[PDB]
Design a protein around this ligand. Structure first.
Ligand SMILES: [Zn+2]
Lengths: 247, 247
């Protein structure tokens, strides 16, 4: 039911709309979206995250949102605040609160909701809204990126699913939506040993910095492989992760 | 068109029909299937692998089968021999040989083919036939496992996607097809540093040996994380991998 003029009126209140994408794999996409959100929240900024990933609700898992209940006020759908930084969150998972396990939704029962979440949710005047797009460069992340009309785009890949085609493909999509790639994050680019500190490229060297230099992306960072990170992300305590790779 | 009496007549010629499965992820399932096949081939046994994974043709990638061409003789569909051990291989990918990139097929256009590959392919008197099932414990791997009527089942998981439910679920499926779980392989259970040799459980400790002890699985092995393995598997040279974790 929601219309463009309604979505535009809502989103306009948001100063920054950063969409996060990745190749078909999408490995680390969501975790990177939370880490980014936590980066800004910890800076004293008002952060909000929208879940648009058809393939399982990662975000609500990373933040341990088991409560997952949707409420509605005069301003619209009420987002669930994160337990530690009060980051606003909206996910498909919240539609069935009494479910203790993640449930994959249908196909068309997503495209519409994402639009309704973009315009009928009370995000408020938060200055940063991260949209966790569904993995891949297909039409799924294209429609979401269009309705969201981001103010910037961030690409998340790995030493294996990171090529100049995935990036150029993201460079096109960014223009096909009056936006642009602002950053590139290479996930699990390497592993630093906790005993002697030696570096190992388990998945190989992603050479993510080269591509960031090729198309001169304004920002680039390589997050490493860490027993802790993975351990916290799975137990839904990413907010407790005491490391900031975006700084 | 193929019928049960035709599939049974073919498979009967095969002494061992080992089906390989895993949780929704299926991470390492295929690579483990090749490593196993290479284990037997290197032992001087006649090995054959059937590709039944709806989600991308891993096997033909692991063995670098770019040629990927299907031929037909008086005995039926001719399998493609591996470049080094002459392991017979049949995959959906071989239907479109002139394609230099893997293409994901539809849904119903798979269930039928797998049956046709099980009975109209010239496997011969090979004593080991490994079926690479599609990931998960859903109906997809159920129908394949029924037509294949394996003589044994192997479960492949990781320190995160390895639970007593996935295994018990595999214990049921095995009985629902007059078969049984013969082994359990834990993939990427740990990483051994090449500098000081210290062990790290990046994805956590899978405790795969505990489960193998719980339901007393006859076989269990933990394959580690290795820069080489991954590097060879991606470049389609798993046959050159000089390590045998099944012994
Ligand atoms: Zn070390």
């Amino acid at each position: 039911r929601v219309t463009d003029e309604e979505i535009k009126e809502r989103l306009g209140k948001i100063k920054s709309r950063i969409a996060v994408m990745s190749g078909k794999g999408g490995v680390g996409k969501s975790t990177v979206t939370a880490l980014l959100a936590v980066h800004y929240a910890r800076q004293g900024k008002k952060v909000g995250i929208l879940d648009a990933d058809f393939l399982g609700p990662s975000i609500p898992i990373l933040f341990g949102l088991r409560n997952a209940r949707i409420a509605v006020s005069a301003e619209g759908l009420e987002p669930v605040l994160t337990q530690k930084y009060g980051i606003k969150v909206m996910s498909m998972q919240f539609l069935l609160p009494k479910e203790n396990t993640p449930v994959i939704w249908r196909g068309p029962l997503i495209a519409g909701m994402i639009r309704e979440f973009l315009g009928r949710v009370a995000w408020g005047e938060l200055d940063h809204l991260l949209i966790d797009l569904p993995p891949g460069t297909g039409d799924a992340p294209l429609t979401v990126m269009q309705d969201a009309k981001p103010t910037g785009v961030v690409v998340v890949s790995t030493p294996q699913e990171l090529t100049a085609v995935i990036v150029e493909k993201a460079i096109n999509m960014a223009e096909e939506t009056n936006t642009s790639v602002l950053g590139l994050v290479e996930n699990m680019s390497y592993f630093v040993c906790p005993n002697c500190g030696h570096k190992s490229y388990i998945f190989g060297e992603g050479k993510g910095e080269s591509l960031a230099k090729k198309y001169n992306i304004g920002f680039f960072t390589s997050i490493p492989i860490e027993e802790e990170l993975i351990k916290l992300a799975d137990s839904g305590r990413i907010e407790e992760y005491e490391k900031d790779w975006f700084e």
